[PDB]
Protein backbone atom coordinates (compact mmCIF):
# COMPACT_ATOMS: atom_id res chain seq x y z
CA UNK A 1 0.00 0.00 0.00
CA UNK A 2 2.00 3.01 -1.38
CA UNK A 3 0.16 5.46 0.84
CA UNK A 4 1.23 3.55 3.97
CA UNK A 5 4.68 3.43 2.56
CA UNK A 6 4.79 7.16 2.00
CA UNK A 7 3.17 8.07 5.32
CA UNK A 8 5.31 5.69 7.29
CA UNK A 9 8.58 6.64 5.68
CA UNK A 10 7.73 10.33 6.00
CA UNK A 11 6.67 10.06 9.66
CA UNK A 12 8.95 7.55 11.45
CA UNK A 13 11.65 10.11 10.81
CA UNK A 14 10.18 11.60 13.99
CA UNK A 15 10.78 8.67 16.36
CA UNK A 16 13.95 7.47 18.08
CA UNK A 17 14.39 4.61 15.58
CA UNK A 18 18.06 4.37 16.53
CA UNK A 19 17.77 3.85 20.29
CA UNK A 20 16.20 0.51 19.63
CA UNK A 21 17.20 -2.05 17.16
CA UNK A 22 15.19 -1.76 14.00
CA UNK A 23 13.93 -4.92 12.41
CA UNK A 24 10.73 -5.40 10.42
CA UNK A 25 7.95 -7.86 10.11
CA UNK A 26 5.23 -8.81 7.75
CA UNK A 27 3.70 -11.15 10.21
CA UNK A 28 1.24 -10.61 13.14
CA UNK A 29 4.24 -11.17 15.35
CA UNK A 30 7.73 -10.08 14.70
CA UNK A 31 10.52 -12.50 14.44
CA UNK A 32 13.13 -10.77 16.38
CA UNK A 33 16.68 -11.84 16.58
CA UNK A 34 19.46 -10.95 18.98
CA UNK A 35 22.65 -11.89 20.83
CA UNK A 36 23.51 -12.47 24.49
CA UNK A 37 26.07 -14.48 26.45
CA UNK A 38 27.87 -15.39 29.65
CA UNK A 39 31.44 -14.26 30.28
CA UNK A 40 34.92 -10.83 28.94
CA UNK A 41 38.40 -11.99 27.97
CA UNK A 42 40.39 -14.58 25.97
CA UNK A 43 38.90 -17.82 24.62
CA UNK A 44 35.58 -19.65 24.97
CA UNK A 45 37.07 -23.08 24.36
CA UNK A 46 36.35 -26.10 26.50
CA UNK A 47 39.83 -27.52 26.25
CA UNK A 48 41.24 -24.19 27.31
CA UNK A 49 38.62 -24.10 30.06
CA UNK A 50 39.74 -27.44 31.32
CA UNK A 51 43.32 -26.30 31.16
CA UNK A 52 42.29 -23.35 33.40
CA UNK A 53 40.82 -25.82 35.86
CA UNK A 54 43.92 -28.03 35.55
CA UNK A 55 46.33 -25.28 36.50
CA UNK A 56 44.80 -23.37 39.49
CA UNK A 57 41.94 -21.17 40.70
CA UNK A 58 44.73 -18.94 42.16
CA UNK A 59 43.41 -18.89 45.69
CA UNK A 60 45.68 -16.64 47.73
CA UNK A 61 46.84 -19.76 49.62
CA UNK A 62 48.30 -21.08 46.33
CA UNK A 63 49.35 -17.85 44.60
CA UNK A 64 52.85 -18.18 46.12
CA UNK A 65 53.35 -21.85 45.30
CA UNK A 66 53.62 -20.93 41.64
CA UNK A 67 56.94 -20.58 39.90
CA UNK A 68 58.53 -19.54 36.63
CA UNK A 69 56.79 -21.08 33.65
CA UNK A 70 53.57 -21.91 35.46
CA UNK A 71 50.13 -20.91 34.41
CA UNK A 72 47.27 -19.88 36.59
CA UNK A 73 43.83 -18.51 36.06
CA UNK A 74 41.53 -16.06 37.71
CA UNK A 75 38.07 -14.95 36.72
CA UNK A 76 38.53 -17.12 33.61
CA UNK A 77 41.67 -15.35 32.46
CA UNK A 78 44.82 -17.36 32.10
CA UNK A 79 48.04 -15.66 33.18
CA UNK A 80 51.63 -16.96 33.07
CA UNK A 81 54.20 -16.74 35.85
CA UNK A 82 57.33 -14.73 35.30
CA UNK A 83 60.19 -15.76 37.56
CA UNK A 84 59.53 -17.63 40.79
CA UNK A 85 56.93 -17.06 43.51
CA UNK A 86 54.92 -14.33 41.81
CA UNK A 87 53.26 -12.02 44.28
CA UNK A 88 56.01 -12.70 46.85
CA UNK A 89 56.76 -9.00 46.89
CA UNK A 90 53.16 -7.80 46.72
CA UNK A 91 51.67 -6.83 50.07
CA UNK A 92 48.15 -6.71 48.69
CA UNK A 93 45.72 -9.05 50.45
CA UNK A 94 42.93 -8.87 47.86
CA UNK A 95 43.90 -11.14 45.01
CA UNK A 96 41.94 -9.11 42.49
CA UNK A 97 44.31 -6.22 43.11
CA UNK A 98 47.36 -8.29 43.84
CA UNK A 99 46.91 -9.68 40.36
CA UNK A 100 46.32 -6.26 38.89
CA UNK A 101 49.65 -5.24 40.46
CA UNK A 102 51.50 -8.40 39.47
CA UNK A 103 50.58 -7.87 35.88
CA UNK A 104 51.80 -4.24 36.02
CA UNK A 105 55.05 -5.24 37.70
CA UNK A 106 55.61 -8.10 35.27
CA UNK A 107 55.47 -10.75 37.93
CA UNK A 108 52.83 -12.43 35.82
CA UNK A 109 51.86 -12.08 32.11
CA UNK A 110 48.41 -12.07 30.45
CA UNK A 111 48.45 -15.46 28.71
CA UNK A 112 47.80 -15.82 24.97
CA UNK A 113 46.70 -19.17 23.66
CA UNK A 114 47.55 -18.31 20.10
CA UNK A 115 49.27 -21.46 19.06
CA UNK A 116 51.20 -23.29 16.49
CA UNK A 117 49.49 -25.32 13.86
CA UNK A 118 51.19 -28.29 15.43
CA UNK A 119 49.47 -27.81 18.75
CA UNK A 120 46.13 -28.18 17.12
CA UNK A 121 46.65 -30.82 14.48
CA UNK A 122 49.06 -32.92 16.59
CA UNK A 123 46.73 -33.38 19.49
CA UNK A 124 43.76 -33.49 17.12
CA UNK A 125 42.47 -31.04 19.67
CA UNK A 126 39.20 -29.49 20.39
CA UNK A 127 38.15 -26.13 19.04
CA UNK A 128 36.74 -23.01 20.73
CA UNK A 129 33.03 -22.73 21.50
CA UNK A 130 30.95 -19.65 20.89
CA UNK A 131 31.55 -16.56 22.84
CA UNK A 132 28.07 -15.59 21.88
CA UNK A 133 24.70 -17.23 21.67
CA UNK A 134 22.05 -16.16 19.20
CA UNK A 135 18.38 -16.02 20.02
CA UNK A 136 15.13 -15.67 18.22
CA UNK A 137 11.77 -14.72 19.62
CA UNK A 138 8.29 -13.92 18.49
CA UNK A 139 6.46 -10.88 19.77
CA UNK A 140 2.97 -9.85 18.84
CA UNK A 141 2.40 -6.78 16.83
CA UNK A 142 0.26 -4.38 18.76
CA UNK A 143 -1.68 -1.51 17.40
CA UNK A 144 -2.25 1.98 18.53
CA UNK A 145 -4.88 4.09 16.93
CA UNK A 146 -5.93 7.67 16.58
CA UNK A 147 -9.35 9.29 15.86
CA UNK A 148 -7.64 12.60 15.98
CA UNK A 149 -8.51 14.03 12.57
CA UNK A 150 -11.44 16.11 13.66
CA UNK A 151 -13.34 17.57 10.75
CA UNK A 152 -16.93 19.13 10.53
CA UNK A 153 -16.82 22.88 11.32
CA UNK A 154 -13.15 22.02 11.28
CA UNK A 155 -13.63 20.82 7.71
CA UNK A 156 -14.76 24.28 6.78
CA UNK A 157 -11.72 25.69 8.58
CA UNK A 158 -9.59 23.23 6.63
CA UNK A 159 -11.26 24.37 3.43
CA UNK A 160 -10.44 27.97 4.42
CA UNK A 161 -6.90 26.68 4.93
CA UNK A 162 -7.28 24.49 1.80
CA UNK A 163 -3.92 25.66 0.57
CA UNK A 164 -2.23 23.27 2.95
CA UNK A 165 -5.03 21.45 4.80
CA UNK A 166 -5.40 18.03 2.98
CA UNK A 167 -1.95 16.78 3.77
CA UNK A 168 -1.32 19.26 6.54
CA UNK A 169 -3.87 17.51 8.59
CA UNK A 170 -2.63 14.02 7.86
CA UNK A 171 0.95 15.09 8.56
CA UNK A 172 -0.10 16.55 11.87
CA UNK A 173 -2.04 13.51 12.88
CA UNK A 174 0.91 11.39 11.85
CA UNK A 175 3.13 13.63 13.96
CA UNK A 176 1.04 12.92 17.03
CA UNK A 177 1.26 9.23 16.21
CA UNK A 178 5.02 9.47 16.03
CA UNK A 179 5.01 11.08 19.41
CA UNK A 180 3.05 8.28 20.94
CA UNK A 181 5.23 5.64 19.33
CA UNK A 182 8.34 7.33 20.56
CA UNK A 183 6.91 7.59 24.05
CA UNK A 184 5.93 3.90 23.96
CA UNK A 185 9.50 3.02 23.07
CA UNK A 186 10.90 5.15 25.78
CA UNK A 187 8.71 3.58 28.42
CA UNK A 188 9.98 0.16 27.37
CA UNK A 189 13.59 1.31 27.45
CA UNK A 190 13.13 2.77 30.88
CA UNK A 191 11.64 -0.41 32.14
CA UNK A 192 14.12 -2.88 30.62
CA UNK A 193 17.27 -0.89 31.36
CA UNK A 194 19.26 -2.40 34.16
CA UNK A 195 19.58 -0.09 37.13
CA UNK A 196 23.11 1.24 36.94
CA UNK A 197 24.46 0.21 40.26
CA UNK A 198 27.72 0.70 42.11
CA UNK A 199 28.27 -0.26 45.78
CA UNK A 200 24.53 -0.45 46.48
CA UNK A 201 23.34 1.80 43.60
CA UNK A 202 25.62 4.45 42.07
CA UNK A 203 27.86 5.06 45.11
CA UNK A 204 25.43 3.66 47.67
CA UNK A 205 22.23 5.46 46.54
CA UNK A 206 20.79 6.98 43.38
CA UNK A 207 22.84 9.91 42.40
CA UNK A 208 21.62 12.94 44.24
CA UNK A 209 22.51 16.43 43.12
CA UNK A 210 19.64 17.98 44.95
CA UNK A 211 19.84 20.91 47.28
CA UNK A 212 20.01 18.38 50.14
CA UNK A 213 23.14 16.95 48.53
CA UNK A 214 25.20 18.52 45.81
CA UNK A 215 23.69 21.36 43.70
CA UNK A 216 27.11 21.72 42.08
CA UNK A 217 27.20 22.25 38.34
CA UNK A 218 25.97 18.91 37.18
CA UNK A 219 29.56 17.67 36.83
CA UNK A 220 28.96 14.77 39.18
CA UNK A 221 26.14 13.50 36.98
CA UNK A 222 28.24 13.77 33.87
CA UNK A 223 30.85 11.65 35.75
CA UNK A 224 28.20 9.04 36.64
CA UNK A 225 26.93 8.98 33.06
CA UNK A 226 30.38 8.49 31.72
CA UNK A 227 30.68 5.56 34.13
CA UNK A 228 27.43 4.16 32.77
CA UNK A 229 29.29 3.95 29.45
CA UNK A 230 32.13 2.16 31.26
CA UNK A 231 29.63 -0.32 32.54
CA UNK A 232 28.45 -1.12 29.02
CA UNK A 233 32.05 -1.55 27.94
CA UNK A 234 32.97 -3.81 30.84
CA UNK A 235 29.90 -5.97 30.48
CA UNK A 236 29.70 -6.28 26.69
CA UNK A 237 31.69 -6.06 23.44
CA UNK A 238 30.27 -2.60 22.67
CA UNK A 239 30.63 0.99 23.81
CA UNK A 240 27.55 2.94 24.48
CA UNK A 241 26.00 4.19 21.26
CA UNK A 242 23.29 6.51 22.47
CA UNK A 243 21.98 8.34 25.45
CA UNK A 244 18.55 9.61 26.38
CA UNK A 245 17.72 11.75 29.36
CA UNK A 246 15.09 14.12 30.54
CA UNK A 247 15.41 17.79 30.02
CA UNK A 248 16.22 18.41 33.61
CA UNK A 249 18.29 15.26 33.98
CA UNK A 250 20.76 16.16 31.27
CA UNK A 251 19.60 18.26 28.31
CA UNK A 252 19.77 21.29 30.50
CA UNK A 253 21.85 20.06 33.39
CA UNK A 254 24.78 19.16 31.16
CA UNK A 255 24.45 22.57 29.45
CA UNK A 256 26.82 23.61 32.26
CA UNK A 257 29.66 22.31 30.07
CA UNK A 258 29.15 18.64 29.41
CA UNK A 259 26.76 19.01 26.48
CA UNK A 260 27.02 20.38 23.01
CA UNK A 261 23.72 21.53 21.61
CA UNK A 262 23.98 20.19 18.14
CA UNK A 263 26.69 22.55 16.70
CA UNK A 264 26.61 20.17 13.68
CA UNK A 265 23.88 17.81 12.40
CA UNK A 266 24.79 16.65 8.88
CA UNK A 267 27.33 14.38 10.49
CA UNK A 268 27.12 11.78 13.35
CA UNK A 269 23.72 12.87 14.91
CA UNK A 270 20.17 11.80 14.27
CA UNK A 271 17.75 14.58 13.33
CA UNK A 272 15.83 14.07 16.55
CA UNK A 273 18.87 14.48 18.76
CA UNK A 274 18.89 17.28 21.24
CA UNK A 275 22.66 17.35 20.78
CA UNK A 276 25.46 15.20 22.26
CA UNK A 277 27.51 15.00 25.44
CA UNK A 278 31.15 15.99 26.18
CA UNK A 279 31.77 12.21 26.21
CA UNK A 280 29.07 12.15 23.66
CA UNK A 281 26.84 9.70 22.14
CA UNK A 282 23.83 11.51 20.48
CA UNK A 283 21.71 12.85 23.32
CA UNK A 284 17.98 12.37 22.93
CA UNK A 285 15.23 13.57 25.23
CA UNK A 286 11.90 12.03 26.27
CA UNK A 287 10.42 15.07 28.12
CA UNK A 288 7.61 13.03 29.75
CA UNK A 289 8.70 10.51 32.33
CA UNK A 290 8.58 11.87 35.92
CA UNK A 291 11.81 10.04 36.62
CA UNK A 292 14.18 12.65 35.26
CA UNK A 293 16.50 9.80 34.45
CA UNK A 294 19.44 9.06 32.19
CA UNK A 295 19.78 5.96 29.91
CA UNK A 296 23.00 4.83 28.37
CA UNK A 297 23.08 1.90 25.99
CA UNK A 298 23.91 0.27 22.68
CA UNK A 299 22.38 -0.83 19.34
CA UNK A 300 24.68 -2.61 16.84
CA UNK A 301 24.63 -4.40 13.49
CA UNK A 302 26.06 -7.19 11.41
CA UNK A 303 25.88 -5.87 7.91
CA UNK A 304 22.34 -4.62 7.57
CA UNK A 305 20.92 -6.42 10.60
CA UNK A 306 20.55 -4.65 13.90
CA UNK A 307 21.04 -7.79 15.94
CA UNK A 308 21.92 -5.78 19.08
CA UNK A 309 19.63 -3.59 21.13
CA UNK A 310 17.95 -3.61 24.54
CA UNK A 311 14.69 -3.01 22.79
CA UNK A 312 13.83 -4.02 19.30
CA UNK A 313 11.15 -2.52 17.06
CA UNK A 314 9.46 -4.23 14.12
CA UNK A 315 6.59 -2.37 12.31
CA UNK A 316 4.03 -4.30 10.24
CA UNK A 317 2.48 -2.71 7.15
CA UNK A 318 0.33 -4.03 4.33
CA UNK A 319 0.50 4.43 8.82
CA UNK A 320 -2.97 3.67 7.48
CA UNK A 321 -5.48 6.48 7.14
CA UNK A 322 -9.27 6.17 7.09
CA UNK A 323 -12.38 8.40 7.02
CA UNK A 324 -15.73 8.05 8.90
CA UNK A 325 -18.19 10.72 7.56
CA UNK A 326 -21.05 10.32 9.99
CA UNK A 327 -23.35 13.29 9.85
CA UNK A 328 -21.19 16.24 8.87
CA UNK A 329 -17.97 14.85 10.36
CA UNK A 330 -15.57 13.30 7.69
CA UNK A 331 -12.92 12.76 10.31
CA UNK A 332 -9.57 11.00 9.88
CA UNK A 333 -8.35 7.92 11.64
CA UNK A 334 -4.74 6.76 11.75
CA UNK A 335 -3.63 3.24 12.49
CA UNK A 336 -0.13 2.05 13.24
CA UNK A 337 1.05 -1.30 14.42
CA UNK A 338 4.38 -2.81 15.44
CA UNK A 339 5.99 -5.30 17.69
CA UNK A 340 8.17 -3.91 20.47
CA UNK A 341 10.37 -6.16 22.61
CA UNK A 342 13.44 -6.95 24.70
CA UNK A 343 15.43 -10.10 24.17
CA UNK A 344 13.38 -12.53 26.39
CA UNK A 345 16.28 -14.73 26.87
CA UNK A 346 17.83 -12.23 29.29
CA UNK A 347 15.33 -13.56 31.77
CA UNK A 348 15.60 -17.20 30.79
CA UNK A 349 18.08 -19.96 31.36
CA UNK A 350 16.82 -21.91 28.35
CA UNK A 351 14.05 -22.39 25.79
CA UNK A 352 11.66 -23.91 28.30
CA UNK A 353 11.48 -20.56 29.98
CA UNK A 354 11.89 -18.41 26.90
CA UNK A 355 8.97 -20.16 25.22
CA UNK A 356 6.57 -19.22 28.02
CA UNK A 357 7.50 -15.55 28.19
CA UNK A 358 7.31 -12.60 25.85
CA UNK A 359 10.03 -10.09 25.04
CA UNK A 360 7.16 -7.57 24.81
CA UNK A 361 6.16 -8.33 28.42
CA UNK A 362 7.70 -5.46 30.28
CA UNK A 363 6.76 -6.85 33.63
CA UNK A 364 9.22 -9.68 33.21
CA UNK A 365 11.88 -7.87 31.27
CA UNK A 366 12.10 -5.12 33.81
CA UNK A 367 15.69 -4.32 34.72
CA UNK A 368 17.10 -7.07 32.46
CA UNK A 369 18.50 -5.28 29.42
CA UNK A 370 22.29 -5.70 29.80
CA UNK A 371 22.63 -3.53 26.64
CA UNK A 372 21.53 -0.51 28.56
CA UNK A 373 21.48 0.95 32.00
CA UNK A 374 19.39 3.58 33.67
CA UNK A 375 20.33 6.08 36.29
CA UNK A 376 17.81 7.49 38.73
CA UNK A 377 18.59 11.09 39.55
CA UNK A 378 17.56 13.33 42.40
CA UNK A 379 17.64 16.86 41.03
CA UNK A 380 17.86 20.32 42.71
CA UNK A 381 14.19 20.99 42.35
Amino acid sequence: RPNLVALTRATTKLIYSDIVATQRTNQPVAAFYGIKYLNGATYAGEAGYVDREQITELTEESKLTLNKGDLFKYNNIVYKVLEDTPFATIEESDLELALQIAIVLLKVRLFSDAASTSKFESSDSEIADARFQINKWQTAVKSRKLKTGITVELAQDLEANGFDAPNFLEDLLATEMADEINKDILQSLITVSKRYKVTGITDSGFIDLSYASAPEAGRSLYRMVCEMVSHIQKESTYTATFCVASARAAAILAASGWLKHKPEDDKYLSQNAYGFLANGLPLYCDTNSPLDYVIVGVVENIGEKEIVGSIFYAPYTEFKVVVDPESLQPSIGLLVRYALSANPYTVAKDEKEARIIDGGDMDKMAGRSDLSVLLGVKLPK
Binding site: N26, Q27, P28, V29, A31, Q138
Partner: peptide, 23 residues
Amino acid sequence: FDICGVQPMNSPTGQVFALRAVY
Protein backbone atom coordinates in the same frame (compact mmCIF):
# COMPACT_ATOMS: atom_id res chain seq x y z
CA PHE B 1 -2.62 -34.29 4.37
CA ASP B 2 -5.77 -33.10 2.70
CA ILE B 3 -8.39 -32.87 5.46
CA CYS B 4 -7.09 -29.73 6.98
CA GLY B 5 -6.45 -26.25 5.84
CA VAL B 6 -2.91 -25.96 4.71
CA GLN B 7 -2.25 -22.30 4.51
CA PRO B 8 1.50 -23.02 4.23
CA MET B 9 3.73 -20.74 6.17
CA ASN B 10 6.59 -18.71 4.84
CA SER B 11 7.90 -18.05 8.32
CA PRO B 12 7.48 -19.74 11.69
CA THR B 13 4.91 -17.73 13.60
CA GLY B 14 3.33 -17.85 11.10
CA GLN B 15 -0.38 -18.36 11.51
CA VAL B 16 -3.51 -19.79 10.12
CA PHE B 17 -6.95 -18.43 9.65
CA ALA B 18 -10.27 -20.03 10.43
CA LEU B 19 -13.89 -19.22 9.70
CA ARG B 20 -14.82 -19.56 13.36
CA ALA B 21 -18.56 -19.04 14.01
CA VAL B 22 -19.47 -16.06 16.10
CA TYR B 23 -20.99 -18.19 18.81
